[PDB]
């Protein structure tokens, strides 16, 4: 199905033979089920979960009630997962990191680090024009953006400067190294999106 978890930086695990494997430490606290959606009401089968612990004055009544229907404590934020026919869950149930004890590889979704207004060189890997040899005010500029009379227009999806990052991106099939049940961790190989403290949706690899 999937679990929500805060990113907690990066480390490495040294395997006894020698290999140091760079790991992302994802803390995965008790993901508790706030709602179960089904074909009768909603037209599709899913579960809504929560995690963390939001202070009571910061949570609003419309959500405070929403948690009181389940009976769970008010976690910081809500996420939904689609069920794969066979599995079935109940409201108020706490899903733990022990689901990933069986799996080998995981898709990790997160929000990428925001680079702000990025130019074409940074954003699209556009090539810098000649740094000298006569060049006039046009070193890192994008160059041409179209043809002439014929279109007489720039085409849609033309790679230009603009907002880079702060976008939801998914890194697929990362190898799970260790699944610590006691501290509630999930060590995956490689790097996943977003900064330390960002929320990650970790789930089993679709590309088996």
């Amino acid at each position: 199905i999937g679990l929500v978890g805060k990113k907690v930086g990066m480390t490495r695990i040294f395997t006894e033979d020698g290999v140091s494997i760079p790991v992302t430490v994802i803390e995965v606290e008790a993901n508790r089920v706030t709602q179960v959606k089904d074909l009768a009401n909603d037209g599709y089968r899913a579960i809504q979960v929560t995690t963390g612990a939001k202070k009571a004055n910061r949570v609003t009544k419309p959500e405070a009630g929403h948690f009181a229907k389940a009976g769970v404590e008010a976690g910081r934020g809500l996420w939904e997962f689609r069920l794969a026919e066979g599995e079935e869950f109940t409201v108020g149930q706490s899903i733990s990191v022990e689901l990933f004890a069986d799996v080998k590889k995981v898709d990790v979704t997160g929000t990428s680090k925001g680079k702000g207004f990025a130019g074409t060189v940074k954003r699209w890997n556009f090539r810098t024009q000649d740094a000298t040899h006569g060049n006039s005010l046009s070193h890192r500029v994008p160059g041409s953006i179209g043809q002439n009379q014929t279109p007489g227009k720039v085409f849609k999806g033309k790679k230009m400067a603009g907002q880079m990052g702060n976008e939801r991106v998914t890194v697929q099939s990362l190898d799970v190294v260790r699944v610590d049940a006691e501290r509630n961790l999930l060590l995956v190989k490689g790097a996943v999106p977003g900064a330390t403290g960002s929320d990650l949706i970790v789930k089993p690899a679709v590309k088996a």
Binding site: R12, F14, G18, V19, S20
Partner: protein, 122 residues
Amino acid sequence: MIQEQTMLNVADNSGARRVMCIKVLGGSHRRYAGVGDIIKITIKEAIPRGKVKKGDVLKAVVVRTKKGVRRPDGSVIRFDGNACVLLNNNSEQPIGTRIFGPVTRELRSEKFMKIISLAPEV
């Protein structure tokens, strides 16, 4: 990190003193060689008594780099000079009888086992 126009000192005793990389083999738009890759060489400086004269175009393998080689531990091995060993274009196999200076583990891959046996370290 050897590329076109990179000059290399020669590890073996084939004759060449200084060579120059004229192409990195094994892919289109392939920027660099290193570690134990095959490169195309031109001899820019040779000794008088050597087997290979100046301005000969032949193959070589990079055995040492200043950029260095990463081990799987995260550790790196760097040298103070990019270096190579000349080979016979189509036949491959080293021209020189003996190899000066060390050569890394990542050069170990069947075809270069002659190069490792002659080398005095690693």
